[model samples]
Target: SNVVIEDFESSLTRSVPPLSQASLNIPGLPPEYLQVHLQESPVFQVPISKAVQLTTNDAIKTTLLVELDISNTDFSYQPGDAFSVICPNSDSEVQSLLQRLQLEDKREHCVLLKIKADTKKKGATLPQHIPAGCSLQFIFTWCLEIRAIPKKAFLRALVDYTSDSAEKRRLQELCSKQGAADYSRFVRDACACLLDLLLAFPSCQPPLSLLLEHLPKLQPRPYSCASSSLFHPGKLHFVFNIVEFLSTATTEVLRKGVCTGWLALLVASVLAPKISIFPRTTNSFHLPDDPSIPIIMVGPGTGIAPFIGFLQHREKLQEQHPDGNFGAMWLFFGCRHKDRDYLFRKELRHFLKHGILTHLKVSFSRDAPPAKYVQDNIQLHGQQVARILLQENGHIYVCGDAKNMAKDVHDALVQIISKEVGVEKLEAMKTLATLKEEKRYLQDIWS
Candidate 1:
């Protein structure tokens, strides 16, 4: 028997209701959705040595660069590595749920969770993230992913708890296969969370067990490591944008990303705030072992993170071997405006003046007249880009917006290869595939 330890309010122990009836009634529900993942290893805390706003006030978006002091810790990371930061859910959201559940009075009560021994359900187990004995508040605040979108099965389960017939039917419709578009439009598109649904359907009040069985676990947000481990011994650097979600038709209040928003607020209150982090090492995104291979980097906005580490690593190598035959480094960076959102301008300039950076091409979309992007610059210097890759055995790296920029840059490269090499579009695609196979083209992008 697989034993799963889950925490709950003490009062739940006296009237411990099983999850069999409500959950088992739903057809075609996946068993894995009921289980929560446990973080196998413990996360370490590193203090924020520096936190700076990379974007100016005039900018349309905010990006942050945070440095962590890992001098006392044994943890070390390489260029192009990523790190995961563990963040808790917002207290306000937790409190709101507590009020909605009418369990504010028993917030501190504690209980242990065990699956009923009699259930015929296969692979049924309690979540491990919940400790042996903890408060209802602690479980809600720290353990659960309250902000996650409600799945169709979860929506279906909610119908059972709802008192009003109209509200019940609406929930049923949302979960139905025919109502997919309506569900997507009203719930998924608007990013409506469990709390939002509960508030909207006032008569629906599902038990905590149903929630614990259904709600997915809150996960850590990962960021590209922006500084070379060699550059600063026992120190780490990473950058992220404060993801802002404005009020939609369904969601009335504004909110920032769970991790980024919490981090921003922490910087305001605490100097040198400690954060729990785990390292994620990349296999192929790092620099080539040989110093002679040239590189072309295309990174827009926060995607410029790993390249910063790349340059720092190169600079260090050059300093170590003064006469070493180093590769040519080309950077294509894009943003809305040069004056407002140009990140690490002075540092990049210094790198240029010192000969650490061989070339820098910038695209400012919101500037006067023609709107340009990294893809445009790549096409403009198609000869050079193609030469660097095809003839000189250069490496190409793309990091940033995967949905648009990565796809657009890919198309641009395909076109460039098609024109420069006098090859068919299909052949150009094959060439790109060959480059990828050779590990000359690497991308570290996110959605």
Candidate 2:
């Protein structure tokens, strides 16, 4: 039923508190027009949660996780779902900058926030503003996603505070029309941390309140869940590849990724008792529900996490239905080196011996000079791979990096299809798209 035009504002006022009693007195506009605007208003608010790590190993890149035992939070998720985590900026960076500026004591001072009517009218709320009494560390941790790239407007705002005349000119050029040619090459390509920016431009110290008012809300970093409910009831898991950055020219180490490296540090330090998380739902990435469906999983590096869960789920189902004939399972896994980073090698062999996995193909890229990857292994098993897809109606699952690995694997798959099925390139692409649309071809990729 259509809502009566007269009742729309009344209903909206009842639903959202901030906009209650706010009037819309625009001349010559229909009630339906105002109702349409209200319908388009944003109403969603996602609560923030924190996670602390229990243990970590730098050698193998593994972390044993724990949390702060927050009540009434659920972390249940499906295969494609991701966990969004709110991570903090490093305390060392914050403290170093504060000491350099001689404002360590003043860092904790409170400040007031007065919002413009236009800003409020745009559905932006008070939570968007940073209030007084909140520590700078608190603002960095809970309120701001520090790793976010600066907008052009933000750089323009910093021109007044830059000290060196030449440096200020360069900054202005980078943000101005004359520097458009070097924008992507120079300024855009450079990655600057919040702490580094503050240290460089000490005169640009905006009040904590102003900073909060301008800085964007911290967004959660999403990670794919790696544990299946069928195998590990009431628990979830994820695997991450910790990334560390070093400046090649200066021979100085810069920093690690905010979330994953933070998790590794927390796990090493044993800071919290239990981790906190929220489940995100995904529609496209899921396994076939049928127990008899043959599955081919290709996961390289940390991508193997979700596939591990898939295999466990299948193994559990096989145990429960002993008489049923579970279809063949194949896995193509690759890593840089066998001795250095052969993750879950013994566990995968155990699955094969137990008849849970029918075929397992492993590739070690750096083992030889040629650097063979997972796609090479796929090409080696091209005939059987095609047989599984064309004859047995098997599903293909790929989980890994999106840029090179995914593209390489996809091209290899298409080549295999073209060779084995005797189809042209165009037809092979069509077949692949059809398989994807049917949900038989699935990808769990992240940049």
Candidate 3:
């Protein structure tokens, strides 16, 4: 009777933080940065329809292009958006772990859950519903990813459960570093995976209930949609580059990325079948509304996904507004090689020939003896890039890795502006900031 629907809605409507908060430097991030908004618990179940393998690197990293049929689902989305797909972890891992602990049946048993209000949400609390028959498999598979990296607080919680004095001290030391360097280095250097951490301290078998109590909802990764609504009404498409890496310290092979890997597997499993998805709308990552404005796109690897949509949108606009002046379109695409990794190669060339794209400059990093990247390409074409920005007032969009690529690209842009316009660092910074404020400079970057 105390279930307040309005309160549920309000809680669900809260803004979720980006995955990597420290790197993004978003202001006033809640301590619980990984928590996701529920937003009515999205009840729709869509089926996979079709999946196409797009690219596979020499390392055997595969990218898939997928299409889903969500016609019956309640999910709806717009262009420049992404959606979350709830996926269960492989049953093999779960079964093996349960067998190793000889707690298969016990692990499958249901546990009680009780909701407690934090200080911030004291008055807004609601009565808890006791869903008695929920299995651990259900909770782990449908509710959470067990292999996810434990937050710093989670490791601290493990300290109390550990009987070994040395282990507890180590965890405490790791969590209490002065500059957050330990956590970063641990996550980066140790090549530690979530499951490995949990397995390390087997005594800390916190009940699924307690785990759920502390663990945030599994947030879905966002991908840029590559299809234009104008060209393909009621349908959306996404291009993704798969991520794979080996752990530095442990030498453990981390096989897949949560979202992209899931997508790749789904696409591979359902070849030529349609897949369903919902969109998460994004602002400040779209093309200029005016077709006549010169546009410069900086995309490397799978980052070129959204630019395909932009070009399609422009093509549609041309059909509708024939007399309008269509400004020059410039694309800076970078990848490892020309033959295999050159994504959308034929398509981009076709666009150039047809006059849909005016300038298409590519940087194949592995093609030459000395590797080159996107920033190198930007520097090589600095004069023309400056002219486009200063003279033609072009809108520049960058989509790629946030850690190094985006920052390097921004620095390169500033350097070009300084060199061409003969301005000091401060003035150049101000100019770039102003452009960003005006939405002339935009970046859609993620780690």
Candidate 4:
């Protein structure tokens, strides 16, 4: 490995000095360069539980602070663990779905089910998520992902229910093996939601039982536990932005995030709402057993969710052992505006003031010649950032939008090592790859 590394290093004509903490100068990315896009992938997280609006007055973006009360049972979670919530559609959205399905007249009518479809058929059997005596309204809102992408099997099944001949032929190819390209372009790549597909194929009204069996499960959405268990017993806290996005083909066809929108409305309307949720622990994203190891956190927007818990846990440890040798804590936070969407401003500032947070770098994308994002800021202090990770045996943790931000941050780090470490790009890639192999480059991201 050393021979391979040395050969790669010799390619670089200019030698770069080893990064030293004492002489390190943190990068202040100048206000310049920025760009943007939306991610079409879907990973629906779960439930409502107890909720509150953490942001007050005016702000560019809305961030919610939810306290999910589940301590009455045997449920438990670590600070960085993720928990899922059972988020139902807002009443209005549910009503809209009922109207579109022409089932509004019997929206609240409950029905018991006994599957009569061929058991040999793919996904013919009803799923366990749905229960007996569930109402149509309940089914629409909480039971089915009416807005999620339609599976090919569902499309195939839709062909049988279509009343129109042309529509039946159209549905046939979509579900066929030879129609993969057509399926991607027309349905998946175009970001066609279930509602969109239904509207487009108005002649196809799938049987209630068939819809139950075919539609994707309205699964719970997961959130990183933001508040520490040590500080807030019998309660868990998480933050999420209400996701609203437009169509890739046309901005006119706007789409609301299924779980997020429901969660937002639930929090806003009912002062004390209770929803079912469960915590899921991942061994990979959790904090190290040692407190002395330095951590570099890059969390933009609600990516800051887990780190909030991380800091709280550290703060508790700090108070408990005041004389302990803690490590350099660096947080690279970014948002659209410093004045508006700088989340946890007060608490984070407090950390900076009290020296709990050793270093902070903030990038406001709204600034002229915008600082771009946390990734760009990472580039500005590439050498120092590389120094912390490579020399001090530090850890890098990133949590945020997986579609773009995670990839952007990764590219920046790769660039940093290639330049700052005086190694080839491939060599730099190997270095980060090693960090991931050792479980040092931890990430908790979502689309």
Best by lDDT: 1
Q: Quantify all predictions' global Cα lDDT against the true fold.
A: 0.81, 0.62, 0.64, 0.72
lDDT of 3 by residue, 184-297 (tens): 665535555445555554555543333454555555566677777677765566777777765522334576665666666666657643333445544558777776789899
lDDT of 2 by residue, 1-447 (tens): 984565344220122222222232222211110100001101112222233331233344443333222233444556545666656666765566456545566555433344444332354446543444465546655567555555555556556556676455555554555444444443345455444455444555533433343457766677776656777665566667776654211234656777777777766644332334555654556667777888889998878877777777778888898989788889999887776666777778888998998998888877765337889999999999888888888899898865688888888889999999999988888888898888888887888
Candidate maximizing TM-score: 1
Q: Over all chains combined, what TM-score does candidate 3 have?
A: 0.76
What's model 3's lDDT at 34? 18
Q: How do all the candidates rank in terms of TM-score, highest first?
A: 1, 4, 2, 3
Per residue, candidate 1 scores C-alpha lDDT tens digits across 327-391 of 99999999988889988899899889989999999999888864389999999999999999999
Clashes of each: 1, 6, 9, 12
Better lDDT candidate (1, 4): 1
- lDDT, candidate 1, equals 0.81
Candidate 4 local lDDT, 228-342, one digit each (tens): 8777777778898877776432325655677777766667764356667765644457777888888899999888888888888888889899989898788999988776778
TM, every model:
0.88, 0.76, 0.76, 0.77
Per-residue lDDT for 50 in model 1?
A: 84
Candidate 3 regions with alpha-carbon error over 4 angstroms = 1-45, 56-60, 70-79, 96-103, 106-111, 115-134, 151-153, 159-188, 191-194, 202-205, 247-252, 272-276, 369-371
